[PDB]
Write a protein that binds this ligand. Structure first.
Ligand SMILES: Cc1cc2nc3c(=O)[nH]c(=O)nc-3n(C[C@H](O)[C@H](O)[C@H](O)COP(=O)(O)OP(=O)(O)OC[C@H]3O[C@@H](n4cnc5c(N)ncnc54)[C@H](O)[C@@H]3O)c2cc1C
Ligand SMILES: Cc1cc2nc3c(=O)[nH]c(=O)nc-3n(C[C@H](O)[C@H](O)[C@H](O)COP(=O)(O)O)c2cc1C
Ligand SMILES: Cc1cc2nc3c(=O)[nH]c(=O)nc-3n(C[C@H](O)[C@H](O)[C@H](O)CO)c2cc1C
Ligand code: FES
Ligand code: FES
Ligand SMILES: [Ca+2]
Lengths: 198, 387, 204, 408, 251, 446
């Protein structure tokens, strides 16, 4: 369908929030050393942001939308509460299930879950969903697109920092500064799709 | 001074261990050979700039007011006395002279300030002055609008050297194209000086649109140039008589230069093949789809191949081995990706008229990911124990 | 004592030595009048949250400590949000989501999980104020070096006349985008690590 | 006004539902079962604990504590253990002191192992015998300006089994001791007065454990002999706290007893019989004398070696009554020394300066085959660096160079 | 067990924090609602020309002068109701009060149009001198919203101000330039044939032109956007049926 | 496996005519102590002692045993130590004919001996210094055994002797060597031969595999890839054909066989030929009067992978079958980097060399251009034929990492093959020695 593919490509390439909204950088610039290390984190972000968007959208359209529970009353001033609470509960439960029911997958996904239990890149996604007021069928697609775009961005940065093993960075900038400059140049590259419509 | 003998002479050293014979090709030869490959394009671009300037200016002004104008900016103030006249039938002696008077200050400032940065950093780290600066200086000076003031170019090259290449550790150590980063700096920080309709023609007080941008607002019959009033045809844009930048015209006069290096093995032909196949495939797809809106949907591949800034970028910017992928099968992916982007962001992105400068910076980021994928496949093969 | 609060300014800078709190830093600094409010909010929220969590540090459980700590920090951020929308709503519109993003701004997370969980409430409060001030130093310097070049103004008050009014300056367009923050922070890190050499990273 | 309580109850309900779901998941999935740790391969006894604890700290509660010198802090870098089951998940923090080749056979850093499932240990036999004793100091002679010959009386004359070069564990309680009452001879009292070392004191409120290496050789039992070094802080930094454990031992009085424990083997002499070169510095005199006595008085192997020592002055010289006798007693053993700045009354003739130059100029530079012998160094870094640089210049490698330090 | 020791503390802290959170939330709601208006009040007063310094004065003279009103786009007639709390932005988001436009209808690139809008009238008494019209269209990067002030003749523009545009400053978002705004005084919306004749002229409109306004320097997409916005919202599917009545009188 | 389509065999001047001829007199013969990777010296001799042929001369203290034997009788004259007391060369002077005798067998017995007996006799003789383990190039331990023993019955090094002429002379000795090798495997013996015909053995364990094409199609490293991929857990052994001849002579007669055939040739060699000599002969005395007047650098081994032989190193290496000479190119040329030289050479088409088919150059030892960072220009792709991607493996090697090099396949190589990729590099790096450093690091930390 035009809408349910346009929204996906939109979230994937035009507003990559790793590099167009610039969220989640505290881990973007921290866990980026090996491609086969950042791939697992990308997968974990994909699953967390594909799960936490639909449930939050359901609860928002059910009990925190104004007049949705009782006419003339609203509960706008606890949306942050419920978003962060459901995010933390889902992360904890998923980590416990990963360690219990399917142990071999813990090495690939379960280890990374305690890091992203709270994060800008996920909270901002939830807030943007609630701000743009999506329906469920498009909200799930938006969440999946956001996750996959974040995974793509972090994997590309891991590849760049792997290739840069031949560099001769000056001693002062060694590490953190060169990572920041690389991310800035990455933004300069990704400014290509600033104006396209979808 | 007498110190230039270091870069004139060969050092005259001998090997010490391992292979005691060495191939005679080297970095100092490669850079200079690229430096000598653009000339059949640079001279034509200078001539074209002079011609467009003369045609537009004499189409606009005449008489005593024209005398005042030619007694205005130092371009005309100098070329009127140095052996030429500003009339409508002027030939080489005025056209090329005006083009050179426009181009030389930009180059002489870019080269000086970039060389200052390079010598400062090289003296701080105490290595020999690298030879990868001439190519970047030429390839940046060749891709700016003629009316661009000197200090904006100085800031652009300063950014493109210090922020993109020099900090990462010099030639061969960086990961993104220095000259294209330098042009992106201007393209994003001063849009009213590098893009538009008032900077593409050297004539003072004249308005002339980018050749490509006219199709974005009208059909194939809207490619009209107001220099004297004619129609821009495919053969016209292929010979390179359209308005445009100082060096990105005359696709033929640039292909003649680029074929030399491509045949010589300096530039990989795999990337060129991949970019061409991607561009033709995606443009044919768009043409088949079609739509009454966004008039650019109908331009075919043979029209895309010559318009605007495609040929020069494809032949020189893409083939940069440091930025490009390394694996033999990854070069194809790099080429196809850049070929898709240079049409996608020019067809379905109305905000920007020119695309290659963005597409190269986009694909440089994904250059090593293809390398990693191919390497992982090869390692899987080896662990399967078949070589 | 006075001598120990300035450490997060240079010695243990939260954005220079460690990687906490970068999203707000690189997103808010488009102006200066917004950077000041963002730094005051971070300072006050961090200080109060550390004080409270250290006050009740001996009775909360470690099984679900995440929920309790994010509840006690959310009950403060959801108050500062209403305060901003009641007094400085003209500023608050500009920050948009980032005013709410103080929930997960890793400064509070790290400081609460590192210091207030095992220290006395008053040192926890002082630690919070110090870390906030250290973060605010970088915030304000990046804000100055962005706004002054991007608009010829500081705190929304003209200092460099623009070319529209025949001024000496032309507003740089790139500074108003995001990649300006990245390079500015990078050169800031270079200066910090070259004037305080003991923080230089290792080779291998 | 009405919506305030409504928001309150909704907030409480949603938080309670979240916590209820979290605990409903927790109380049905987490194993929380008994975990059994085998101290050896099919051992006589096992340990049962709860998951989540550190392996070394859990095991130390039942015994068989390890030779780690930081007590679980990960600072020693030598809490090496071997486990062949439970988990092969080597941690990146263990790679600091574990190698790719050695990791393949289940060796681990116990300080970084967190217990989650059943696993088995394969610790060597001799570790199981670690225990504690309390002994009385019977001689605390001041053999030099900064050393003491601390003699201990072992209870019941028990012959503790050990190899030369091993180290025992000693504990000390909280203390407050001033240096004005230490046993210093009047000749060395002038040297102490030179910087007024009597004025120093230290306040310690904690128990402290360290490691000490015995001077006597294994065939000598019932009496254990330890050398203790000066505990003063550097004069250039007067406010640096002094050596706590060393201060306690220096202040320990005759007749009064202290607790000893943990005879741990390390720095073993090689099984071969090649020529040996013995270089010592400062407090390494105890392991040097132990190793010298060991094979000679116990094994009687027909080896050949020499002991080279460096001293500030003749005042800092001791054990000459033993070395000058043994050298004449047997032709297999020689000993030499050099003085840095001997006093005019020392009447010294022979080698002077630092030990490295005299070693090179007297023995190594004209040796027949320096690459077929062994080297042992036990001394301060300012001598260790010089001797190792000399030896690497001479052409010996890591497999022949053996050394350690006395905790700094 | 930790069960009771966790439930007790979590419920106690929830009760502790919910009361303060809710008290803060409901306490400031009045101030939020009141302060949400000034950012638009300043623009409306400035476009009407009644300068007011300070929020107190701004609300005072707006309460004195301007009367909000509603209008039906079809037939160009007024409707009953109140406009002080009418959400024009939301009115386009619901089918009951909006219609999705088609290809020939979508000249402003909005795709949505409310069935009943809001029109502001400035008064010096029981008669109207100027009438403010809120008009919006789609630019290059995003939407733009603006006020066009016309006199009671239904022909002349008295002032134009864009209170939020979201374009690139310097060339795109130059619509906020006071000099560019000062051009719009005296221009004419319609011609003799009653058709909308406002034209954005590139390179500078001819001096004294009655239908031209200078095109934005180097922002042709933005100039085209503003031209499309006016050409749509002055047509018979916009404020044209109402403008006919403005010229008919009774304003 | 039968063909290769990459790599450029270097067109040099002074190719040797493949005709065996007698050689000059030999005075000093030495054993080099640095080419034996990982070996550390423990000598059983002192300056002035007297030794016999095949007698133990020195043994290494790393490996258990693997005694190195003097190649001919005489007396020890000097021991040239190096910096940090490394063993460089043990020079002995030829005198007398005292030798150590070993057991002898018959032709029929040579296929069914006992493996332990064969190994004992071989290691006691000292020919065990020949075999090298492919993943690390070190001589195998005294007791190890692997199922793949590769015999290099071809040679495609530049200006090198043709094995078809040498093997044909000894004839049945090669067959005896192959038959005795057939039992020292536990696997199979692979002999890599050109399209021509070679003496053939009747043991089903051995095999014949045909290879032909450019230069890299003759090294054991490349022979590995298409027949038995070497891994960390699958080591394999390689030996040149003359050592097979020596082993066959040993187990057929009972005395160590020490003669060698060296292909003295080069750009500056007055008259190339196939010389007969004893291993480790003094190069300065072997090349006497065969040089034309001029400053020359005597280089042992093949030109791409040899070691300079000035002074203490002036002796034939154990693993080298050829000697070369080059003219010292110390001259400085004005704008020579840009001058379109007719006589210059380059793998890329950036010079006039590739226009003239079959032209022959007098290449010298000039390192064109100083050290610069490698771009690269995709030069290595035309060179390396093994199924691996070198244009980034070389970057990894130059970065100092070892963990990823092992993954990419740095194990399957050595300085024997990577020299060709060092030769074509534009940055003028030394990947040949860099690979040795990386392999040493992996061996140490492994
Ligand atoms: C295996 C082994 C064997 C040993 N064998 C012997 C032996 O045979 N004989 C022997 O004498 N010792 C030996 N030692 C060393 C023994 O552990 C000493 O007691 C050691 O000095 C620790 O004792 P301490 O804690 O009293 O002193 P430490 O405090 O560890 O060191 C004393 C010195 O350090 C200074 N100091 C204290 N705290 C600090 C600080 N925070 N910063 C800077 N300087 C500080 C003190 O002022 C003083 O100068 C051995 C150690 C080991 C590990
Ligand atoms: C970075 C950048 C951003 C731009 N943004 C806008 C914009 O927001 N609106 C606009 O009308 N033009 C914008 N432009 C300019 C247009 O792309 C283009 O130059 C203009 O439409 C000139 O068209 P013309 O030649 O037909 O007059 C921008 C240019 C650049 C380089
Ligand atoms: C074929 C070729 C193309 C090049 N293209 C560029 C280019 O587009 N821009 C540039 O700045 N340098 C270019 N260079 C110069 C050089 O490779 C560049 O600065 C590298 O990024 C340096 O590492 C080129 C060099 C070669 C050989
Ligand atoms: S990543 Fe944005 S605050 Fe942590
Ligand atoms: S307990 Fe100290 S290193 Fe592990
Ligand atoms: Ca409106």
């Amino acid at each position: 369908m035009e809408h349910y593919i346009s929204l996906l490509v939109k979230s994937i390439f035009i507003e990559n929030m790793a590099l167009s909204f610039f969220l989640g950088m505290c881990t973007f610039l921290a866990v980026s050393k090996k491609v086969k290390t950042s791939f697992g984190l990308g997968i974990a972000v994909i699953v967390v942001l594909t799960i936490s968007v639909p449930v939050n959208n359901l609860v928002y359209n059910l009990v925190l939308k104004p007049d949705a529970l009782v006419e003339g009353v609203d509960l706008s001033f606890l949306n942050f509460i419920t978003f962060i609470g459901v995010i933390a509960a889902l992360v904890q439960i998923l980590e416990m299930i990963l360690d219990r029911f399917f142990p071999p997958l813990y090495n690939a996904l379960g280890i990374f879950l305690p890091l992203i239990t709270v994060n800008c890149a996920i909270f901002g996604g939830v807030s943007f969903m609630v701000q743009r007021d999506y329906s469920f069928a498009e909200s799930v697609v938006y969440g999946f697109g956001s996750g996959v775009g974040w995974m793509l961005a972090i994997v590309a940065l891991a590849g760049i920092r792997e290739k840069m093993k031949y560099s001769d960075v000056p001693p002062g900038l060694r590490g953190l500064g060169i990572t920041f400059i690389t991310a800035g140049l990455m933004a300069l590259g990704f400014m290509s799709f600033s104006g396209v419509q979808l | 001074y007498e110190a230039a003998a270091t870069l004139f002479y060969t050092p005259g050293l001998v090997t010490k261990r391992s292979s005691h014979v060495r191939d005679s090709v080297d970095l100092k030869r490669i850079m200079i050979m690229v430096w000598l490959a653009v000339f059949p394009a640079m001279f034509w671009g200078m001539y074209n700039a002079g011609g467009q300037a003369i045609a537009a200016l004499n189409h606009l002004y005449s008489g005593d007011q024209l005398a005042a104008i030619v007694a205005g900016n130092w371009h005309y103030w100098l070329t009127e006395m140095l052996g030429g006249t500003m009339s409508s039938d002027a030939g080489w002696g005025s056209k090329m002279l005006l083009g050179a008077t426009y181009f030389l200050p930009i180059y002489a400032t870019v080269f000086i300030v970039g060389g200052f940065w390079e010598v400062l950093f090289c003296m701080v780290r105490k290595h020999e002055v690298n030879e990868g600066f001439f190519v970047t200086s030429i390839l940046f000076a060749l891709i700016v609008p003629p009316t661009l003031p000197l200090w904006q170019a100085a800031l652009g090259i300063t950014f493109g050297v210090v922020v993109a290449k020099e900090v990462f550790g010099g030639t061969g150590r960086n990961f993104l194209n220095p000259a294209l980063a330098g042009r992106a700096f201007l393209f994003f920080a001063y849009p009213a000086q590098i893009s538009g309709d008032l900077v593409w023609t050297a004539a003072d007080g004249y308005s002339g649109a980018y050749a490509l941008s006219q199709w974005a607002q009208g059909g194939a019959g809207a490619l009209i140039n107001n220099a004297t009033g004619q129609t821009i045809t495919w053969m016209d844009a292929f010979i390179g008589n359209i308005p445009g930048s100082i060096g990105e015209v005359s696709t033929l006069a640039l292909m003649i230069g680029a074929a030399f290096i491509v045949y010589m093995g300096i530039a990989s032909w795999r990337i060129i093949g991949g970019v061409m196949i991607g561009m033709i495939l995606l443009s044919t797809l768009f043409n088949v789809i079609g739509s009454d809106t966004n008039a650019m949907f109908n331009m075919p591949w043979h029209w895309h191949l010559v318009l605007g800034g495609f040929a020069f970028g494809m032949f020189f910017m893409a083939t940069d081995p440091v930025s490009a992928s390394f694996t033999n099968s990854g070069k194809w992916a790099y080429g196809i990706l850049i070929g898709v982007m240079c049409v996608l962001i020019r067809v379905v992105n109305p905000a920007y008229p020119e695309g290659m400068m963005l597409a190269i910076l986009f694909a440089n980021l994904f250059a090593p990911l293809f390398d990693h994928v191919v390497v992982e496949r090869n390692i899987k093969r080896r662990l399967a124990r078949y070589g | 004592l006075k001598k120990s609060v300035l450490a997060p300014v240079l010695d243990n800078n939260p954005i220079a030595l460690q990687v906490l709190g970068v999203c707000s830093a690189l997103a808010v600094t488009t102006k200066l009048e917004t950077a000041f409010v963002m730094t005051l909010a971070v300072m006050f929220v961090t200080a109060l949250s550390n004080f409270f969590v250290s006050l009740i540090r001996n009775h909360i459980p470690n099984s679900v400590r995440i929920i309790v700590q994010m509840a006690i920090i959310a009950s403060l951020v959801i108050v500062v949000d209403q305060i901003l929308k009641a007094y400085l709503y003209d500023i608050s519109k500009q920050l948009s989501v980032f005013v709410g993003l103080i929930i997960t701004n890793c400064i509070v997370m790290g400081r609460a999980e590192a210091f207030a969980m095992k220290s006395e409430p008053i040192p926890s409060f002082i630690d919070g104020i110090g870390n906030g001030l250290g973060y605010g130093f970088v915030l304000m310097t990046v804000g100055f070096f962005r706004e002054l070049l991007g608009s010829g103004k500081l705190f929304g008050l003209e200092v460099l006349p623009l070319i529209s009014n025949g001024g000496w300056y032309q507003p740089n367009g790139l500074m108003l985008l995001a990649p300006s923050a990245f390079f500015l922070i990078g050169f800031m890190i270079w200066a910090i690590r070259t004037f305080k050499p003991e923080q230089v990273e290792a080779k291998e | 006004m009405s919506t305030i309580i409504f928001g309150v109850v909704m907030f409480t309900l949603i938080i309670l539902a979240l916590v209820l779901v979290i605990l409903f998941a927790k109380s049905k999935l987490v194993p929380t079962g008994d975990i059994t740790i085998s101290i050896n391969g099919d051992p006589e006894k096992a340990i049962v604990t709860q998951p989540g604890g550190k392996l070394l700290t859990a095991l130390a509660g039942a015994g068989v504590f390890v030779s780690s010198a930081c007590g679980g802090g990960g600072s020693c870098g030598q809490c090496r253990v071997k486990i062949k089951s439970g988990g092969g998940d080597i941690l990146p923090t263990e790679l600091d002191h574990i190698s790719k080749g050695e990791a393949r056979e289940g060796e681990r850093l116990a300080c970084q192992v967190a217990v989650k499932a059943d696993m088995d240990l394969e610790l060597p036999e001799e570790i199981f015998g670690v225990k504690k004793w309390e002994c009385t100091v019977i001689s605390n002679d001041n053999k030099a300006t900064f050393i003491k010959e601390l003699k201990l009386a072992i209870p019941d004359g028990e012959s503790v089994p050990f190899r030369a070069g091993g180290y025992i564990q000693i504990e000390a309680p909280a203390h407050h001791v001033k240096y004005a009452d230490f046993d210093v001879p009047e000749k060395y009292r002038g040297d102490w007065d030179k910087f007024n070392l009597f004025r120093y004191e230290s306040k310690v409120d904690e128990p402290i454990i360290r490691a000490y290496s015995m001077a006597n050789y294994p065939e000598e039992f019932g009496i254990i002999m330890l050398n203790v070094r000066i505990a003063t802080p550097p004069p250039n930094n007067p406010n640096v706290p002094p050596g706590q454990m060393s201060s306690y031992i220096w202040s320990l009085k005759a007749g009064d007893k202290c607790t000893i424990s943990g005879p741990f083997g390390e720095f073993f002499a090689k099984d071969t019989d090649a020529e040996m070169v013995f270089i010592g510095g400062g407090a390494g005199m105890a392991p040097m004398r132990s190793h010298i006595f060991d094979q000679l008085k116990r094994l009687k192997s027909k080896r050949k070696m020499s002991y080279w020592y460096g001293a500030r002055s003749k005042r800092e010289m001791f054990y000459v009554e033993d070395f000058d006798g043994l050298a004449a007693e047997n032709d297999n053993f020689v000993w030499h020394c050099a003085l840095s700045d001997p006093q005019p009354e020392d009447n010294w003739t022979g080698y002077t300066g630092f030990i490295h130059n005299v070693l090179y100029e007297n023995y190594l530079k004209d040796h027949e085959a320096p690459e077929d012998c062994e080297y042992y160094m036990c001394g301060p870094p300012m001598m260790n660096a010089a001797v190792i640089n000399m030896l690497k210049n001479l052409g010996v490698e890591e497999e022949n160079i053996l050394l350690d330090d006395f905790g700094g | 067990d930790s069960i009771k020791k966790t439930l007790f503390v979590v419920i106690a802290l929830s009760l502790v924090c919910s009361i303060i959170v809710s008290a803060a939330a409901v306490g400031l709601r009045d101030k939020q609602k009141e302060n949400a208006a000034l950012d638009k009040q300043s623009k409306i007063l400035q476009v009407a020309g009644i300068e007011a310094k300070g929020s107190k004065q701004i609300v005072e003279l707006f309460n004195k002068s301007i009367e909000p009103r509603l209008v039906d786009f079809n037939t160009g007639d007024f409707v009953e109701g109140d406009a002080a709390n009418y959400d024009q932005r939301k009115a386009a988001k619901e089918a009951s009060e909006s219609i999705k436009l088609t290809a020939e209808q979508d000249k402003a690139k909005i795709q949505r149009r409310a069935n009943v809008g809001v029109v502001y009238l400035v008064k010096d008494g029981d008669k109207t001198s100027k009438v403010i019209l809120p008009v919006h269209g789609n630019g290059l990067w995003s939407m733009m919203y603006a006020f066009v002030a016309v006199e009671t003749d239904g022909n002349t523009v008295s002032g134009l101000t864009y209170y939020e545009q979201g374009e690139t400053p310097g060339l795109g978002g130059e619509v906020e330039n006071p000099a560019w705004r000062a051009q719009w005084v005296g221009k004419k919306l319609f011609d003799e044939n009653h058709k909308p004749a406002i034209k954005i002229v590139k390179g500078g409109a001819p001096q004294g032109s009655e239908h031209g306004v200078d095109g934005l320097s180097g922002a042709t997409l933005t100039s085209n956007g503003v031209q499309n916005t006016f050409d749509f919202w002055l047509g018979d599917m916009g404020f044209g049926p109402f403008l006919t009545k403005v010229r008919d009188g009774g304003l | 496996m039968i063909t290769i389509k990459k790599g450029l065999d270097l067109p040099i001047a002074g190719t040797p005519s493949q005709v065996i001829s007698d050689g000059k007199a030999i005075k000093k013969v030495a054993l080099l102590g640095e080419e034996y990777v990982g070996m550390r010296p423990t000598m059983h001799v002192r300056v002035g002692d007297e030794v016999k042929k095949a007698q133990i001369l020195f043994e290494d203290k790393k490996n258990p045993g693997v005694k190195f034997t003097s190649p001919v009788s005489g007396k020890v004259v000097e021991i040239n130590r190096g910096a940090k007391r490394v063993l460089q060369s043990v020079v002995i002077e030829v005198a007398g004919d005292d030798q150590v005798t070993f057991d002898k067998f018959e032709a029929n017995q040579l296929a069914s001996l006992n493996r332990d007996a064969i190994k004992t006799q071989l290691v006691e003789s000292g020919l065990w210094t020949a075999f090298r383990t492919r993943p690390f190039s070190k001589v195998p331990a005294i007791d190890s055994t692997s199922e793949a023993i590769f015999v290099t019955a071809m040679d495609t090094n530049p200006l090198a002797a043709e094995p078809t002429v040498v093997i044909n002379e000894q004839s049945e000795a090669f067959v005896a060597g192959l038959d005795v090798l057939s039992a020292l495997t536990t696997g199979k013996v692979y002999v890599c031969k050109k399209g021509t015909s070679l003496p053939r053995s009747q043991q089903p364990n051995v095999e014949e595999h045909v290879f032909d094409g450019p230069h890299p199609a003759g090294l054991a490293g490349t022979h590995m890839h298409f027949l038995y991929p070497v891994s960390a857990d699958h080591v394999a052994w390689s030996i040149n054909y003359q050592d097979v001849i020596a082993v066959g002579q040993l187990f057929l007669t009972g005395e160590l066989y020490t003669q060698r055939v060296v292909s003295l040739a080069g750009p500056v060699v007055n008259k190339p030929r196939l010389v007969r000599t004893v291993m480790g002969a003094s190069l300065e005395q072997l090349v006497d009067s065969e040089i034309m007047p001029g400053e020359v650098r005597i280089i042992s081994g093949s030109v791409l992978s040899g070691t300079k032989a000035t002074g203490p190193h002036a002796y034939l290496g154990r693993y080298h079958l050829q000697v070369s000479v080059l003219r010292e190119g110390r001259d400085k040329e004005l704008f020579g980097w840009a001058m379109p030289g007719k006589n210059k050479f380059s793998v890329t088409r950036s010079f006039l060399g590739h226009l003239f088919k079959g032209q022959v150059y007098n290449m010298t030892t000039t390192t064109n251009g100083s050290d610069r960072s490698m771009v690269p220009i995709g030069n290595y792709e035309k060179v390396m034929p093994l199924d691996m991607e070198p244009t980034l493996l070389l970057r990894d090697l130059c970065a100092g990492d070892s963990d990823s090099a092992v993954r990419l396949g740095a194990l399957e190589l050595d300085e024997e093959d990577l020299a060709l990729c060092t030769f074509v590099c534009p940055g003028k790096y030394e990947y040949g020695q860099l690979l040795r450093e990386c392999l040493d690091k992996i061996e140490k930390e492994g």
